[PDB]
Structure formats: structure tokens, C-alpha cells
């Protein structure tokens, strides 16, 4: 009935997503996470963090740190698959999804391997401010090695996200909700977050992906494990 | 061991399903739904309803009404992509999966935007009676803009349905089962239903799909929300 | 003129009243839950009138004669459902006519009520705006009437009388409990409407009220 000619930019986006579909063996694995520990730590020290570094303590920094550690444990997933070669990245360049007046825009955070939580939050706020002003350069969206998506801010229980090419895997975050959960053999109310990991099976087998995501889950269940590097 | 040449009908079916895979960026999100209130009202008022209209109060009508409301909130999802464009449909047409002497067949229910629960049941009964009699004209399967599937009649916990072309979304229903759930911060036995939503990412981003499904879940959790078009 | 017209209405129609009780709990519960959402969604408060209008329109679809009006020698059935609503103004009670209520939804009913009340307070209501009704819903409960015998607005044949909700002892599953109850009045013309039609009409109205899901199920 009613027709609208698609903008060449958004057609280009759709075609790039189709290319990512065809080129990479898309599949997803999942793990569950009791966010309780990090939630309590944030609820306790958010005022201190915000006053010390002039910026609130969100959730993103913890996932960024966990992903960087796990990627250091997994040299293949951070790497990118190309025409005939594995491009092993010595540096961790994570990508973050933030809402925009133009839809969804994904900046790039570089050398997250050395960033501290306060610095991660500072970078996030800086790039979000750029996005709000629409003063984000196109080069700010290039140079990535992995991507973390946030569907949970909008309330998804869990789902399958699509990797940004040429990256080989992404993490898909989901809404925290209180669900029954066994703790020390007792059913208790627990704030649980569902985690999805979509990856390329052409170069990453099941074992690497599941170990990666299980390691992330273990790291996030006890933030002290980062402090102990275990 | 033995060979069986397939029917050209099933060859067409498989080929068009593969075309669906190649054309649309197939991905799925998920949600959980405490169907308790709806089955309570259904169990209470089914005798009155069936005595009032001659048709038993099933479950499809609630999903149809929820989908019509949510699609009225989501013009893009009702629409479809045709090789360069989006054709927004001013009307709501839903394919429904119903068993037959062959099995799953999808008639189209038209102008559901105005159709009321009793008349929804009447329409479903008429088309599914055509289904048993195998007196379904081929054009009865032509005209749909969205599809509601029912895998729960056979007992799937949750799966990944395929959209019927040229539509861009499909809902997958699943078997109701008593599971632990949190009510007011307590673990209780709650009959829950898993909902899967498979859609095309080329035109529908994750945010649209998750808002669509979350709104549907909220709508179904309280029929009073339909009563208040909230 | 008003007094003489009311006297003529008394002399013409066989005015008489029946009554029913109503456990109003469910509807005020859902209203208290969703009033913020409704007001934010449609820019208008969620009062009480709209639900009664919807119930009356449904039950009048079930009762064609009550919608109809009695005239010189004929009954004039109505394909439309028009309802007068009593609202206070700087000149006292005034009854605007709500038209084609058979299709109005709760938000639309609230919008109509709000715009007509705004017209009423500002006295920007045309006289024709109070013409066309086929039934009237009065609300004496805004002041605190327990129950009463309201006077029908001619040429209409029936009227609803709202009354103040109060917590009263009531039986639920054979248990005496504190229940917020509204008492209902129904003054109608017996010349053409017998007692059975009026009582079935009001009882169906009641049933619709205590279970708002019944509107969803058109039962």
C-alpha cells in the first residue's frame, strides 16, 4: 500500500549485516549470571566513586574488564578472520552499543587492557557525550576487535545478537530480574542476568566459546577474582 | 538405505524457506510470561463465553489482540521489505498455524484490528473447519503481514520459528508449565509460558523487537491493559 | 420553565425506581494501579464516569427498548447511543450530550468529558450541545448521597443514579468483610418498560461493573 524508498545508508547497513550473516558461521551459546555481588558493591560504593572521579559507577566497566581478561586468556577470539588469515590483535579494542538520535551507534574503545574502571567510565561518558552532540567522527567507529551489546536496558530476558564484522564474536547483555535460584542448596530470590555469546564457528569451536563465557561468568560472580587475576 | 524422491510441493517449501534464510537477517529474542491471570479469567468465564457465542474460549484470541495492539504501536513490524523498500500495511493480517490432514497450514485473518475476541474465535473456528474439510482456498493463505505460531500444542519449551515470507517477524508460542517464579520477592509455583520472537535485523533493530515483545508480555500479563489500551 | 418541564416529565412518564448494590472494589483497584499510566498515555485523568458509560452502552445494546424513547403515540428506537452526564458548573448542574458512545473507548470518553466540562465551567457550551441524548447518568455521589430517586430527563425513559462509595460490611465467600460499596438507582418509565426489563438491565450493568474483564469478553 504505502511505500518508502530506503535510504542508501540504511540499505548499506542491511547489506553489511547480510554479508556478516553469509561470511561467518553464526551461532550462540549462553550462560547465567548472579549479578548480586557486583550489584551490592555498586550500591555500596557508587557515591564514593561518583564523588572521586566525577562520574557515576555504571555496569559497563565491569563487563569491559572481564572481557579484556578473558580475551587475554583466549588469543583466538580477539583475533579477526579475514580473506585467508587470522589477524591476531595484540591490543583489546572493545565496541559498545549506545542509543542515538539516529538509532544505534557503536563507538570503539581502544587499549582497554590497561584502562581502570574509572577510566573506562570516563571514556564511556566522553563518547556518549560525543554521541549526544552527534560529534562522533567516523573513525571513532573503526578499529574494533570485539563488541558488547546491551539489549537489557530495553528489557530482553535473553536473545541472539549479531556480530559486527569483521569481529568473530560479541556478547549480548540482558535485563536483570529476580528469579528463583539455588544458593547453597536452597531456593532463594536472586538477581539474575542472562548472557549470550554469538560467535563464528569457522575458526572458533564450541570449547573456546564456552570456556570464554564460563570464565567471564566466574569472574563476574566475584569481582575480587580480577584483583587476584584468577 | 532406501530412496524417496520428494514432492515438488515440499521442494518449493524447502526452497522458499532457504530463500527466507538468505534474504532476511534471521535472529530471535525471548521473553517469559506469567499466564496466570489470563488462564484464571479464561477458566472462570469459559462456560459463559461458549454459551454466549457457541465457541469455546481458547488462547489464540488473546495473542491476536496483543499482536494487533503492539503492531499498532510498531508500524515497521507490521510492514515488509520488497527488494528496495518498506511497504507499510495500513491493515493487520495474521497467519495462524493450525493442524490439518496434512498438518501445519497458515490461513490469514484479516482486519484483526477491529476483530473482537468472540469473533476472533469464530474466525479461527471457520478457517480451521475449512482446514479439517480441506476446503481451504489457496488465497486464504495469501495476504498475511505477521504470523503467530503455536509450538506449545506439542510441548516445546522454546525454539526458533521461521517467518513466513514476505513478513519480517513471527511469534513462537510454547507449552505452559509450572515453574518456580518470583512474586513480591518470594519463590512460588507459577505456570509460565516462553515466548520467542524471530525477526529480520535488516530493517528491525534489536530495540524495536525487544520493545515489541516486552509490550506484548505486559499486555498479556494484565487484560485490563487491553481494556485501557495501555 | 425548568420546574414546569420537570412537572410535565413527572406527569407524562410512569416514573418509578429500582435499586442494586455494587462491590466497586475491582474497578477502583485497577484504577488505583493504572491511573498514572493512563493519564500519562492520554493526557487526561482516569475518573469513574467512563466505565459506567461503557457498561450502559453495552447493556443498552442488550436492551433496545431502554435506548428507545416514548413520544406522542410511538416508540422511537435509536440506532445510536447518546448519554447525558450531570456535571456541576457556575450555573449549577448541566447535562451535555455524549454522542456515538457505542464506539468511544475509555480514553476517548475521558477526553470528551474533560472538554465538555471545560466548556461548562467557562460557559462556552452551546445549547445544542445538551440536545440529542437518549439516556442520562447522574452522579449524586459527588456530594455524598447514600441513594435517592433522581428525576428522568425527558424525553428519555431511564436514568442511572450514582452514589457515594463507603466501606460497609459485605459477604465474600460467606465471610463478613469490609467492602467499599456503591448503591445504584434506576428511575424509569413503566408505561413502556416493565419491571423485568429494568431489573435485568441494572443487574447486567452490575455484573459488568464488578468484573471489568466482562467488557473485554463482551459478556
Curated annotation (Swiss-Prot), chains A, B:
A cellular-component GO term for this protein: mitochondrion
A biological process from GO: tricarboxylic acid cycle
Keywords: Acyltransferase, Lipoyl, Mitochondrion, Transferase, Transit peptide, Tricarboxylic acid cycle
GO molecular function per UniProt: dihydrolipoyllysine-residue succinyltransferase activity
Cofactor binding notes: Binds 1 lipoyl cofactor covalently.
Entry EC number(s): 2.3.1.61
Subcellular location: Mitochondrion
Pathway where this protein functions: Amino-acid degradation; L-lysine degradation via saccharopine pathway; glutaryl-CoA from L-lysine: step 6/6
Catalytic center residues: 201, 205
EC category: transferase
Annotated catalysed reactions: N(6)-[(R)-dihydrolipoyl]-L-lysyl-[protein] + succinyl-CoA = N(6)-[(R)-S(8)-succinyldihydrolipoyl]-L-lysyl-[protein] + CoA
Cofactor: (R)-lipoate
Function: The 2-oxoglutarate dehydrogenase complex catalyzes the overall conversion of 2-oxoglutarate to succinyl-CoA and CO(2). It contains multiple copies of three enzymatic components: 2-oxoglutarate dehydrogenase (E1), dihydrolipoamide succinyltransferase (E2) and lipoamide dehydrogenase (E3).
Similarity comment: family membership: Belongs to the 2-oxoacid dehydrogenase family.
Protein's name in the database: Dihydrolipoyllysine-residue succinyltransferase component of 2-oxoglutarate dehydrogenase complex, mitochondrial
Organism, scientific name: Dictyostelium discoideum (Social amoeba)
Boundaries of the shown chain within the full protein: 210 to 439 of 439
Amino acid at each position: 500500500e504505502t511505500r518508502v524508498k530506503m535510504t542508501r545508508i540504511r540499505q548499506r547497513t542491511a547489506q553489511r549485516l547480510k554479508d556478516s550473516q553469509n561470511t561467518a558461521a553464526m551461532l550462540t551459546t549462553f550462560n547465567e549470571l548472579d549479578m548480586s555481588a557486583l550489584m551490592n558493591m555498586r550500591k555500596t560504593y557508587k557515591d564514593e566513586f561518583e564523588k572521586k572521579h566525577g562520574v557515576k559507577f555504571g555496569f559497563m566497566s565491569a563487563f569491559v574488564k572481564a572481557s579484556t581478561i578473558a580475551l587475554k586468556e583466549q588469543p583466538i577470539v580477539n583475533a579477526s578472520v579475514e580473506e585467508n588469515d587470522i589477524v591476531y590483535h595484540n591490543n583489546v579494542n572493545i565496541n559498545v552499543a549506545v542509543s542515538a538520535p539516529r538509532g544505534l551507534v557503536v563507538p570503539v574503545i581502544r587499549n582497554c587492557e590497561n584502562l581502570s574502571f574509572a577510566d573506562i567510565e570516563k571514556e564511556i561518558g566522553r563518547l556518549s557525550g560525543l554521541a549526544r552532540n552527534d560529534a562522533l567522527a567516523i573513525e571513532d567507529s573503526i578499529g574494533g576487535t570485539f563488541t558488547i551489546s546491551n539489549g537489557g536496558v530495553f528489557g530482553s530476558m535473553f536473545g541472539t545478537p549479531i556480530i559486527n564484522p569483521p569481529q568473530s564474536a560479541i556478547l549480548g547483555m540482558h535485563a536483570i530480574k529476580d528469579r528463583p535460584y539455588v544458593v547453597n542448596g536452597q531456593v532463594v530470590v536472586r538477581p539474575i542476568m542472562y548472557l549470550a555469546l554469538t560467535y563464528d564457528h569457522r575458526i572458533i569451536d564450541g570449547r573456546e566459546a564456552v570456556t570464554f563465557l564460563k570464565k567471564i561468568k566466574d569472574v563476574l560472580e566475584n569481582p575480587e577474582r580480577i584483583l587476584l587475576e584468577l
